[PDB]
């Protein structure tokens, strides 16, 4: 039983019924956690950890803004929905989870063959840094330039002075 399917089923239910802004900042965290875990267990543990290191800091800053802008509006308001229309919507959605229509690509299993030629064996992050700091160093230096612009941009927007 792939229990990640159940997790996304609950998350989709709570995204349809979410009312206030605090629930939305919880839908975000309830989305990154399935992403981080599935990356950890299937494809990339490096990027599972990079997601946690960067998105959490963004989440708390996002949460602190909710405190300064919460404006009483959706606590006392009413929503109608209907339990039957919610579950029927989620049932129809769950029916079609085939993002791709290449049946052979989705059904036939493949393998790779290992070789011993790579005797200098290092992590993916060392190769990523090796290329990023040598061949795509321009991409890194532009990213540094964009980060500098954000620093100036945030000040010229928020600072009253």
């Amino acid at each position: 039983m792939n229990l990640e399917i159940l997790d996304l089923s609950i998350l989709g239910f709570y995204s349809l019924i979410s009312s206030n802004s605090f629930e939305s900042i919880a839908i975000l965290v309830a989305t990154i956690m399935p992403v981080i875990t599935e990356l950890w267990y299937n494809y990339s543990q490096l990027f599972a950890l990079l997601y946690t290191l960067i998105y959490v800091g963004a989440v708390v800053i996002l949460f602190v803004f909710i405190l300064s802008v919460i404006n009483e509006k959706e606590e006392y308001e009413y929503e109608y929905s209907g339990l039957f229309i919610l579950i029927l919507v989620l049932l129809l959605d769950d029916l079609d989870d085939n993002e791709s229509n290449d049946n052979d690509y989705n059904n036939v299993y493949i393998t790779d063959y290992a070789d011993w030629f790579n005797n200098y064996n290092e992590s993916d992050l060392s190769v990523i840094g090796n290329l990023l700091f040598t061949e795509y160093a321009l991409l890194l230096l532009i990213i540094s330039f964009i980060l500098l612009m954000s620093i100036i941009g945030l000040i010229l927007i928020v600072k009253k002075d």
């Binding site: 989709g12 995204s15 349809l16 979410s18 009312s19 206030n20 802004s21 629930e23 939305s24 900042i25 839908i27 975000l28 989305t31 990154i32 992403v35 990356l39 494809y43 990339s44 490096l46 990027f47 990079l50 997601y51 960067i54 963004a58 800053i61 996002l62 803004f65 909710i66 300064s68 802008v69 959706e74 919507v89 129809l92 959605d93 029916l95 079609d96 790779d112 993916d124 190769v127 990523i128 290329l131 990023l132 795509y136 991409l139 990213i143 964009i146 980060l147 954000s150 941009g153 945030l154 927007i157 928020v158 009253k160």
Partner: protein
């Protein structure tokens, strides 16, 4: 269910809820990049994934500051 734009009901009714949708939508692009790069054993895709994460975090800050100053403008009397 996607073609009838069911995602328009899943987005909350605050401006910040639109920000979260944008982050989730961009995060879908990065997960697709990581998935393809790992299958191909290609580090160029992972370099792309790292760039997307950093850039997506930049616009999150720039958009937040605009929303922060927008709220300050409403609370402008500040007689205190």
């Amino acid at each position: 269910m996607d073609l009838i734009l069911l995602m328009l009901v899943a987005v909350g009714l605050n401006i910040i809820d639109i920000y979260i949708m944008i982050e989730i939508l961009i995060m879908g692009c990065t997960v697709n990049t990581i998935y393809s790069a790992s299958l191909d054993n290609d580090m160029i895709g992972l370099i792309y994934s790292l760039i997307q994460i950093i850039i997506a975090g930049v616009e999150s800050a720039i958009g937040l500051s605009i929303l922060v100053n927008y709220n300050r403008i409403r609370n402008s009397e500040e007689i205190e």
